[PDB]
């Protein structure tokens, strides 16, 4: 099974050797103990989150705004725990969900501000030489959320 060195004898990419799984499992334990200690002693600040909500994904931080295009059956002023947080991240560490993070790690709070319509969006059809001319004006409802806090817990 020997081939002397030519241009096409060996594959062009460098040969990768993935590590031994036992030492790798111990190393994963050491890294998650590092990151859990960083959480429990409070070594973060201004952490962001990627949140799945209303069929979109919002790269969200604290104190910002998101505007979604449907009603929520919520009077303004009420607070909301946005679930389905599928990535949280501070500086120097991030935590990924598979696909969603646990309900006990991350907790995103959000307040509703304003329930409005939209500006009138025009829908018009036309076909030439056929006397075809329709026209609509549609104002879809909207809601404004304000993301108050993105906390995190050392349960890891």
């Amino acid at each position: 099974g020997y081939v002397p060195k030519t241009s096409l004898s060996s594959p062009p990419w460098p040969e990768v050797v993935l590590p031994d799984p036992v030492e790798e499992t111990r190393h994963h334990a050491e890294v998650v103990k590092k990151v859990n200690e960083m959480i429990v002693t409070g070594q973060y600040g201004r952490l962001f989150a990627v949140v799945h909500f209303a069929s979109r994904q919002w790269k969200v931080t604290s104190e910002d705004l998101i505007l979604i295009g449907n009603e929520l059956d919520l009077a303004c002023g009420e607070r909301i725990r946005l679930e389905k947080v599928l990535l949280v991240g501070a500086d120097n560490f991030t935590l990924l969900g598979k696909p969603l993070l646990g309900k006990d790690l991350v907790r995103v709070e959000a307040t509703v501000i304003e329930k409005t319509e939209s500006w009138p969006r025009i829908i018009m059809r036309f076909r030439k030489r056929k006397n075809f001319k329709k026209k609509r004006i549609v104002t879809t409802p909207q809601t404004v959320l304000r993301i108050n806090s993105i906390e995190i817990a050392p349960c890891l």
Binding site: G1, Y2, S7
Partner: peptide, 23 residues
């Protein structure tokens, strides 16, 4: 040689389809 059963010098060293014009 890694394959003494081969007839060519190319077959005798498992070099079939393994070389280009660089070599």
């Amino acid at each position: 040689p890694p394959n003494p059963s081969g007839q060519c010098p190319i077959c005798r060293w498992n070099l079939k389809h393994k070389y280009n014009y660089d070599d």
